[PDB]
Design an enzyme around this catalytic site. Structure first.
Site, PDB file in Angstrom:
ATOM      1  N   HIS A  84       0.833  -1.208   0.000  1.00 15.13           N
ATOM      2  CA  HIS A  84       0.000   0.000   0.000  1.00 15.13           C
ATOM      3  C   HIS A  84       0.862   1.250   0.000  1.00 15.13           C
ATOM      4  O   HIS A  84       0.852   2.050   0.935  1.00 15.13           O
ATOM      5  CB  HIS A  84      -0.947  -0.046   1.190  1.00 15.13           C
ATOM      6  CG  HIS A  84      -2.026  -1.055   1.011  1.00 15.13           C
ATOM      7  ND1 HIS A  84      -2.050  -2.258   1.693  1.00 15.13           N
ATOM      8  CD2 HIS A  84      -3.108  -1.045   0.204  1.00 15.13           C
ATOM      9  CE1 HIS A  84      -3.124  -2.929   1.308  1.00 15.13           C
ATOM     10  NE2 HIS A  84      -3.777  -2.222   0.411  1.00 15.13           N
ATOM     11  N   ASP A 102      -8.564  -1.302  -8.024  1.00 14.07           N
ATOM     12  CA  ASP A 102      -7.872  -1.635  -6.789  1.00 14.07           C
ATOM     13  C   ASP A 102      -7.619  -3.143  -6.711  1.00 14.07           C
ATOM     14  O   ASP A 102      -6.614  -3.573  -6.124  1.00 14.07           O
ATOM     15  CB  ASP A 102      -8.782  -1.144  -5.617  1.00 14.07           C
ATOM     16  CG  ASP A 102      -8.070  -0.949  -4.305  1.00 14.07           C
ATOM     17  OD1 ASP A 102      -6.850  -0.805  -4.249  1.00 14.07           O
ATOM     18  OD2 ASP A 102      -8.843  -0.882  -3.321  1.00 14.07           O
TER      19      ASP A 102
HETATM   20  C1  AH9 Z   1      -4.896 -12.834  -1.587  1.00 17.83           C
HETATM   21  O1  AH9 Z   1      -4.237 -11.894  -2.429  1.00 17.83           O
HETATM   22  C2  AH9 Z   1      -4.561 -10.580  -2.246  1.00 17.83           C
HETATM   23  C3  AH9 Z   1      -5.444 -10.122  -1.293  1.00 17.83           C
HETATM   24  C4  AH9 Z   1      -5.735  -8.760  -1.161  1.00 17.83           C
HETATM   25  C5  AH9 Z   1      -5.116  -7.858  -2.021  1.00 17.83           C
HETATM   26  C6  AH9 Z   1      -4.222  -8.318  -2.993  1.00 17.83           C
HETATM   27  C7  AH9 Z   1      -3.938  -9.663  -3.119  1.00 17.83           C
HETATM   28  O2  AH9 Z   1      -3.084 -10.197  -4.047  1.00 17.83           O
HETATM   29  C8  AH9 Z   1      -2.465  -9.292  -4.956  1.00 17.83           C
HETATM   30  C9  AH9 Z   1      -5.378  -6.376  -1.942  1.00 17.83           C
HETATM   31  N1  AH9 Z   1      -6.061  -6.037  -0.689  1.00 17.83           N
HETATM   32  C10 AH9 Z   1      -5.653  -5.044   0.123  1.00 17.83           C
HETATM   33  O3  AH9 Z   1      -6.168  -4.768   1.190  1.00 17.83           O
HETATM   34  C11 AH9 Z   1      -7.202  -6.890  -0.371  1.00 17.83           C
HETATM   35  C12 AH9 Z   1      -6.707  -8.296  -0.105  1.00 17.83           C
HETATM   36 MG    MG Z   2      -7.499   0.782   0.529  1.00 17.68          MG
HETATM   37 ZN    ZN Z   3      -5.790   0.145  -2.703  1.00 23.88          ZN
END
Ligand code: AH9
Ligand code: MG
Ligand code: ZN
Ligand code: AH9
Ligand code: MG
Ligand code: MG
Ligand code: MG
Ligand code: ZN
Lengths: 325, 323
Positions: B72, B230
């Site tokens: 992030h 996202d």
């Molecule tokens: C299991 O793989 C992922 C899970 C999540 C994200 C990305 C992933 O892989 C690239 C992005 N997120 C941020 O909060 C939600 C959860």
């Molecule tokens: Mg966010």
């Molecule tokens: Zn994001």
């Protein structure tokens, strides 16, 4: 003794129409502390939740200090009044043995904190002036989110954690309920809250004992949200000498806001223009469009428990209307 | 700087080499990509944004993404910005969105994770953090990203919206808040259900172009669009996707290390001693990413087919790495 008169007046804490302004004066401008302490003792909440008395008083005094003593309406007297009004509504026969001790604690604590640190101007004013509060809260229930954040943060001050002896699950449940209740005091939520309360009345279930049957969180919290919202909007339901003092205070607070808007070249908010105000017409409209629709529905939910309260509201509407022509 | 300019020629393409851009720009991908997109869409002339103000704001914004958070950070922000930029140009969405709506979706994407601490909302709630106390446990991070993104416009020479009217500013602000709050994953299921309802009732022209008459429908599409952006990592070329996976697992594992040290229950996917990275990617695609992108692809049919194809190839590849 001034303390003897105070104690006498606090014997009325289970009554609609408590002399809350007199208690404010007799207690040295500590109505919220003395009324909350009296209510906690009356409901045995210190024993039930193992709340040390000195912690309760320390928190209540700190919470009360964070209401603005220079704001005419949204001050510690209003908070004390909403606490005491919720305490009466929780005792209505139609709710006997319905709510747990933790739910009762949540409703009373939410009432006590529900306007803390209010600046005496509306959410719309804070949004339109690009205030720091509106920037922090993304224009969404700006004041109400702030009241919650202050009310909970003050629990972390020295000897202020009145919930120190609750279990973790109790603290988690109480926090969620208090958040849900105070966010429901945002008037932008009123129409949807009332619509939902009407649907509950139309579908209501009563137990074999005659009390409301509430068997899931959504129904329980909706009743507690509307209970505290009714307490927050209870001024026109009180005996007229109390209602008129609340009207004088809200008008002063509104006029001061409208003076800020006028100076800034803003359109003056409804009811905020001391040069084009109709206080009496404004009360009749407030009752007809907001307060009576809500209280008639609450009265239907607990029918007939709230009939005298509704009767007073209707008499007070007639009195204000009679001052117009 | 000439190679950096060559990479930025792909700004309109899915699969931009965003990590190469991050390196070549001296860790300023968010600034260079936002500037490129604003030039490409003529947004500076349209909104009378002085170029120096734009760059000053972008650099300040980018400075408030944490360089020590593996996922992030400013590269993710730049990626979401550029992904939204591509999705806004879907042929089936032609004539849907005004310039102000386009500005709002792009600005929302740029700020949507600013000042992210690299731990989840649940972590912030369970640790009794100051953020969760401020925001009453509700979309804690997302409210904070908005508040930071807007507050930075008040820094010296940072108000990129200075030449919008008060009414344009108020409309843009509301749309940006509605979009960023919709990036909270706790809202994913409701957003997806509304996108499906919109697919089931969709009206198009004879050219297959979406007709969205009411603001409620248009903001829901923009909320789902930035949410898709996202959640676009598994739809990118595999070399990009695998870098994103390495980064989110590092950030998750660091959260798990903090939780373990505190004695907290370790969050899903956050326990480096009991993880299955590849099974987690297949599950994340199967339950979240593919349902969302399949619905988006239906909305814009057939314009998202190549994106959906990549996602499906990448799912099959990750599955094949499981013995
Ligand atoms: C299991 O793989 C992922 C899970 C999540 C994200 C990305 C992933 O892989 C690239 C992005 N997120 C941020 O909060 C939600 C959860
Ligand atoms: Mg966010
Ligand atoms: Zn994001
Ligand atoms: C028109 O009269 C009133 C309006 C309002 C209140 C009280 C009033 O009279 C006593 C209380 N509120 C606080 O924000 C909502 C608006
Ligand atoms: Mg008496
Ligand atoms: Mg004070
Ligand atoms: Mg209030
Ligand atoms: Zn109030």
């Amino acid at each position: 003794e001034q303390e003897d008169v105070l104690a006498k007046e606090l014997e009325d804490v289970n009554k609609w129409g408590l002399h809350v302004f007199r208690i404010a004066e007799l207690s040295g401008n500590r109505p919220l502390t003395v009324i909350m302490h009296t209510i906690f003792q009356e409901r045995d909440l210190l024993k039930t939740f193992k709340i040390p008395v000195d912690t309760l008083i320390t928190y209540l005094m700190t919470l009360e200090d964070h209401y603005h003593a220079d704001v005419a309406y949204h001050n510690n007297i209003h908070a004390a009044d909403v606490v005491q009004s919720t305490h009466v509504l929780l005792s209505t026969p139609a709710l006997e043995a319905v709510f747990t001790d933790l739910e009762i604690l949540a409703a009373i604590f939410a009432s006590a904190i529900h306007d803390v640190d209010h600046p005496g101007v509306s959410n719309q004013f804070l949004i339109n002036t690009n205030s720091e509060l509106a920037l922090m809260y993304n224009d969404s229930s700006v004041l109400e989110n702030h009241h919650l954040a202050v009310g909970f943060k003050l629990l972390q001050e020295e000897n202020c954690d009145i919930f120190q002896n609750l279990t973790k699950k109790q603290r988690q449940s109480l926090r969620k309920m208090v958040i849900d209740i105070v966010l429901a005091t945002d008037m932008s939520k009123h129409m949807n809250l009332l619509a939902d309360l009407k649907t509950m009345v139309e579908t209501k279930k009563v137990t074999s004992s005659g009390v409301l049957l509430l068997d899931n969180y959504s129904d329980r919290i909706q009743v507690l949200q509307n209970m505290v919202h009714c307490a927050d909007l209870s001024n026109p339901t009180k005996p007229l000498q109390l209602y008129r003092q609340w009207t004088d205070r809200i008008m002063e607070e509104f006029f001061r806001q409208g003076d800020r808007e006028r100076e800034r070249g803003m359109e003056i908010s409804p009811m905020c223009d001391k040069h084009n105000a109709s206080v009496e017409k404004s009360q009749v409209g407030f009752i007809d469009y907001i307060v009576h629709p809500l209280w008639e529905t609450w009265a239907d939910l607990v029918h007939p428990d709230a009939q005298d309260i509704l009767d007073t509201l209707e008499d007070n509407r007639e009195w204000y209307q009679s001052t117009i022509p």
